[PDB]
């Protein structure tokens, strides 16, 4: 019998029912340097079964209460048995309180504790977050519980099922503001002990978990707007960000985005009010806090005068997944964190749904399947890979929880869930979720849970018919790994699954239940017309009159990519899909267009088609205005650049390209008036941007004499910025790129003195892309210099002049000679070896290329790698692959590319 405070799950014998927490930062340093926050604390806990032990959560907490650690008292007029003693547990986190004696089943106590912590920059539990305000250093207060750090803060029991009411109070400087989850109660008070300092409680919350709790005390000011439910809704930033309008954009989503979704969840917004915290550098992006989201603040905050349309979207989709968990996950819990999938994945889909409702003439929800769907796809199509569920008896420790926060939870998870959406009708999975949301409002469920509720929805209706039960379809899509290519010969009509991997020689050793089966929901359309659904069962092979075709006719599967699978044809069907695209594109959705190119791209890798049918079904891209088919092209050839661009194959390759982007560069051209005016909505902003950028690193003179008129233009007049912030990346790049020292030290300047971070990044990334050699040597001279460089800043700079193919071996010989700076800088911050070996190594492609890494590990003798270590071993392994593909590839390619570049 193991003891029970060596178990890392709670024992179920005692559940919260409701917490005082009261927090005190001291936000002056002690001067030894350690800054501190104070707390005292009471739990009300109801026994459930007799047990003479409290095991409680505490982590890096000392205690200072009278007597023993806590002080136990009975509710009412319980008795409560004396405390034997109280000890601290730090591998399991625990406080535990051993009694003389038994708590009684139905009777409820309180334990009262004080305690101290340091608020230490480590963004975990109660912390303290430093930035400059001109002359002055700031430091705010602030927390982030996700997932176990609740207990870093105060005791408590911190696992997301065991929810209660918390009463917060904080403790601060009276000139600082605070907040919290739910809304002050009245005007602060001064502290008897010290009027310098103020108390500020807060409204009791709603029943809810411990690791969506939040409290901050800053010098913060905000942005209001009374909902017409008289919700209040605000912004908070610093002072100086507030008065700049940064916060109006966050402001003007943020009341839609809470409207769609109080409809969307057939569930009123469940709070009084809606706080929105931009913080600087804010690691963890974004935390859903429930009623007080956090966010880093580029993602939060917008500058209409140097921020680009990329950047307003993702404001408003960061917005909408946060504020999606007010419901979904806030609300209703997932009871443990082998679910989080659910919760994140949920979120990640309808993300797009509520920014969608914020701006309805972006066609936001396409972007789902460029950036979830195929990102997601290309790690799921590994031997590697794992299922969306684990079983919650294997996630135990803090780290095992941790791992669950990956790709797959949140954009396979988003994938899979807007797949059955589809298959369902939104109507019919609004209604199963309005139905699982109102069953579960302040409790906890599993993803079985909202299956059934889903299933009650189905089964009162008749028109959505399924060929199995909500759970066995869905099972097939979370308790297995990976997903199926689907290949149809079109000569019968016969369509197969098979379990998909990029390596065609991989060895899968996952097993599955269903022996790598799925069901699969495939929609269709025929000549341009959509065709009855149909479902795959869980068979090998099958056949069906909807995927046979006639010789001058074309079916394609799986529409928008809903489904979340590839598509393979025969090759025949693929060519009449090719002559469509060629002469009249517009019969086939964008989405579909670009799904073409991103699976066949995906299908070549594997072996399953020739690289050349691949290429083949980019030539229609000379007559595409749309953004999605090209990003699609644009993303599948990155590789192609980075193996090819120190080859013979890159002179044929930038031959096509410009070939191929020529018309639409001439089209923008024209549309925006000679570039004085962007395109309206959103896409065909993204579609000009990719356009230029594509132009001009491919060097078309027309994109090049733009990009070189522009920045001269901005050179003779400093402070009036004539190139649209949409354009500033590739406009700044190919401007340095043709330029010398003169654009490259004016650029410095305007980098020296940024004060926006986007700005920055744009100016520090474009630096390197000079064709000097000495430019970007002194350059590199630079980056490891924090008066010139931000530390946090210098492995990015390296990799992007690693990214010039002038910088490459520069970059690499820098590496290699100043690799004696793992002994300065993985203990001066954490620096990223690991992203830095990546970066440098990216391009290797040939036994030399090898035989040199090889020789750079043969420092092993001493030093080592750091964070990097497997990051190096990760290098030799993709320069062995990158190897045998270009082997294989270069004479096919190169032939390509000179057939097809006129
Ligand atoms: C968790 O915190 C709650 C808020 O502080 C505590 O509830 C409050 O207790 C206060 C004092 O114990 C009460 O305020 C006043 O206290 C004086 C004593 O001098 C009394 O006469 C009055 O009852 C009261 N005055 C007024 C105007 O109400 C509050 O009644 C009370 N606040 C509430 C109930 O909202 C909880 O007791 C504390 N929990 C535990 C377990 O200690
Ligand atoms: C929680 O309690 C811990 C244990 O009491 C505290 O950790 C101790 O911090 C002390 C001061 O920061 C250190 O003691 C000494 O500090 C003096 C100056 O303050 C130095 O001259 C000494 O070098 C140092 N003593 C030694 C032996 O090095 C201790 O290092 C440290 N003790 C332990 C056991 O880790 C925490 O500070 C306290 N935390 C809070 C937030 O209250
Ligand atoms: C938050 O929502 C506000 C209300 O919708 C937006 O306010 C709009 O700002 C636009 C951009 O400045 C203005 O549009 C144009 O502004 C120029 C300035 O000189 C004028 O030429 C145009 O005539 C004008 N266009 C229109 C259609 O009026 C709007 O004046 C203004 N609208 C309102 C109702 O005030 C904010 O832009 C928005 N904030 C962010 C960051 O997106
Ligand atoms: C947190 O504050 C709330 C609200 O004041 C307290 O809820 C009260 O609980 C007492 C004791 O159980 C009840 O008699 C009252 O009916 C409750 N009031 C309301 C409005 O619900 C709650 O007890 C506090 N939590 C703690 C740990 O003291
Ligand atoms: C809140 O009060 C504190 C203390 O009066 C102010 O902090 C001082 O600000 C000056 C600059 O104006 C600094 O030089 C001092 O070093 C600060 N002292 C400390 C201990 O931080 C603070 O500016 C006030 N804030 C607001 C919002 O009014
Ligand atoms: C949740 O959805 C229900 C069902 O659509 C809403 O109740 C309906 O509201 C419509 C709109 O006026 C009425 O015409 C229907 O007759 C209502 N149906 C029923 C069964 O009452 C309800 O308003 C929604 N609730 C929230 C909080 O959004
Ligand atoms: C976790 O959630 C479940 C519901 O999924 C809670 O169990 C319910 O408790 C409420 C209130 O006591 C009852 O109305 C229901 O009968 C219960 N449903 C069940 C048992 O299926 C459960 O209390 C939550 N767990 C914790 C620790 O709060
Ligand atoms: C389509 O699938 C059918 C299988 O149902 C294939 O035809 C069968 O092939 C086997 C091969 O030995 C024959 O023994 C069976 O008699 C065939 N069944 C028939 C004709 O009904 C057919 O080859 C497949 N076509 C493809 C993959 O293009
Ligand atoms: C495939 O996706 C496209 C969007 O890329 C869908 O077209 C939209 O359809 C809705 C409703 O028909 C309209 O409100 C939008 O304005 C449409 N946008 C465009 C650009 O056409 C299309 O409906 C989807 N196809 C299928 C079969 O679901
Ligand atoms: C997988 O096992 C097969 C056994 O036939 C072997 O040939 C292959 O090299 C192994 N591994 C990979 C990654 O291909
Ligand atoms: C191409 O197809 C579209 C949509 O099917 C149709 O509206 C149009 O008539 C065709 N365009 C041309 C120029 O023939
Ligand atoms: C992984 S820490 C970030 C907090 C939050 N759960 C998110 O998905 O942004
Ligand atoms: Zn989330």
Not at 87 to 95: G, I, K, N, P, Q
Not at 586 to 600: C, E, G, L, M, T
Not at 642 to 651: A, C, I, Q
Not at 841 to 848: A, M, V, Y
Request: proline share 5%.
């Amino acid at each position: 019998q193991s003891k029970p405070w060596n178990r890392y799950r709670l024992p179920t014998t005692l559940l919260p029912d409701s917490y005082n927490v009261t927090l005190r930062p001291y936000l002056t340093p002690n001067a030894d340097g350690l800054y501190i926050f104070k707390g005292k604390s009471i739990v009300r806990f109801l026994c459930q079964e007799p047990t003479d032990v409290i095991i409680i959560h505490s982590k890096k907490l000392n205690y200072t209460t009278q007597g023993h650690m806590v002080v136990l008292r009975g509710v009412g007029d319980s008795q409560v048995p004396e405390i034997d003693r109280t000890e601290l547990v730090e591998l399991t986190e625990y406080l535990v309180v051993h009694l003389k004696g038994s708590l009684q089943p139905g009777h409820m106590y309180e334990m009262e504790s004080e305690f101290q912590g340091e608020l230490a920059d480590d963004l975990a539990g109660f912390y303290r977050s430093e930035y400059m305000e001109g002359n002055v250093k700031k430091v705010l207060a602030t927390t982030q519980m996700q997932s176990t750090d609740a207990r870093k803060s105060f005791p408590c029991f911190d696992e997301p099922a065991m929810k209660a009411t918390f009463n917060i109070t904080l403790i601060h400087p009276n000139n600082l503001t605070a907040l919290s989850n739910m809304p002050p109660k009245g005007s602060s008070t001064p502290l008897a002990e010290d009027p310098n300092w103020s108390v500020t409680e807060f409204e009791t919350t709603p029943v809810m978990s411990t690791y969506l709790l939040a409290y901050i005390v800053s010098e913060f000011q905000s942005v209001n707007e009374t909902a017409q439910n008289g919700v209040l809704i605000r912004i908070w930033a610093r002072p100086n960000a507030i008065a700049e309008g940064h916060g109006m954009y966050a402001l003007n989503v943020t009341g839609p985005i809470l409207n769609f979704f109080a409809n969307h969840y057939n569930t009123s917004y469940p709070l009084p009010k809606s706080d929105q915290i931009a913080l600087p550098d804010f690691n963890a992006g974004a935390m859903e806090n429930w009623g007080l989201v956090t966010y880093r603040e580029n993602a939060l905050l917008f500058d209409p005068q140097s921020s680009s349309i990329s950047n307003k979207e993702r404001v408003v989709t960061v917005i909408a997944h946060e504020l999606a968990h007010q419901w979904f996950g806030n609300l209703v819990t997932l009871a443990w964190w082998n679910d989080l999938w659910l919760n994140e994945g949920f979120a990640s889909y309808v993300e797009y749904l509520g920014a969608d409702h914020a701006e309805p003439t972006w066609n936001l929800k396409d972007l789902i399947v460029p950036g979830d769907v195929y990102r997601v796809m290309a790690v799921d199509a590994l031997a590697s890979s794992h299922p969306l569920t684990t079983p919650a008896e294997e996630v135990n420790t803090p780290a095992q929880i941790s791992e669950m926060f990956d790709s797959i939870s949140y954009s396979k998870g988003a994938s899979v869930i807007r797949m059955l959406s589809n298959f369902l009708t939104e109507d019919l999975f609004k209604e199963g979720l309005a139905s699982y949301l109102h069953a579960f409002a302040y409790q906890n469920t599993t993803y079985l849970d909202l299956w059934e509720h889903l299933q009650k929805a189905v089964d009162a209706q008749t028109s959505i018919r399924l060929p199995d039960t909500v759970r066995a379809i869905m099972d097939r899509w979370t308790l297995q790994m990976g997903f199926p290519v689907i290949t149809v010969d079109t000569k019968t009509g016969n369509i197969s699954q098979k379990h998909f991997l990029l390596d065609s020689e991989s060895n899968v050793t996952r097993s599955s239940a269903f022996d790598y089966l799925w069901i699969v929901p495939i929609s269709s359309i025929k000549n341009g017309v959509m065709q009855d659904h149909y479902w795959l069962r869980d068979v090998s092979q099958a056949q069906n009159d909807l995927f046979k075709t006639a010789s001058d006719d074309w079916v394609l599967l799986n529409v928008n990519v809903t489904g979340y699978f590839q598509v393979n044809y025969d090759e025949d069907n693929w060519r009449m899909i090719q002559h469509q695209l060629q002469t009249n594109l517009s019969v086939i959705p964008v989405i579909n267009r670009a799904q073409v190119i991103y699976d066949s791209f995906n299908l070549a890798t594997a072996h399953m088609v020739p690289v050349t049918l691949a290429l083949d079904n980019t030539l229609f891209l000379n007559g595409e205005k749309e953004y999605m088919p090209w990003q699609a092209a644009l993303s599948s050839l990155s590789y192609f650049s980075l193996m090819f661009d120190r080859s013979e194959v890159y002179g044929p390759m930038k031959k096509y390209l410009r070939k191929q982007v020529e018309p639409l560069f001439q089209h923008f051209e024209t549309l925006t008036k000679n570039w004085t005016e962007r395109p309206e909505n959103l896409m065909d902003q993204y579609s000009e941007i990719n356009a230029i950028s594509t132009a001009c690193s491919n060097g078309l003179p027309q994109c090049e004499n733009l990009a070189k008129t522009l920045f001269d233009q901005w050179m003779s007049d400093p402070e009036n910025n004539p190139i649209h912030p949409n354009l500033r990346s590739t406009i700044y790049c190919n401007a340095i790129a043709q330029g010398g020292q003169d654009q490259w030290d004016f650029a410095w300047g305007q980098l020296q003195q940024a004060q926006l971070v986007n700005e920055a990044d744009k100016l520090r990334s474009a630096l390197a892309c000079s064709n000097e050699v000495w430019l970007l040597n002194r350059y590199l001279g630079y980056t490891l210099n924090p008066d010139l460089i931000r530390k946090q800043d210098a492995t990015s700079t390296i990799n992007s002049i690693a990214s010039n193919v002038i910088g490459q071996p520069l970059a690499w010989d820098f590496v290699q000679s100043n690799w004696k700076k793992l002994f300065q800088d993985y203990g001066g911050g954490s620096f990223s070896f690991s992203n830095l070996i990546q970066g440098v190594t990216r391009r290797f492609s040939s036994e030399f290329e090898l035989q040199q890494l090889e020789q750079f590990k043969k420092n092993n003798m001493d030093v080592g790698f750091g964070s990097g270590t497997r990051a190096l071993e990760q290098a030799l392994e993709k320069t062995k692959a990158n190897i045998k593909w270009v082997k294989e590839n270069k004479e096919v390619v190169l032939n390509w590319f000179i057939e097809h570049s006129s």
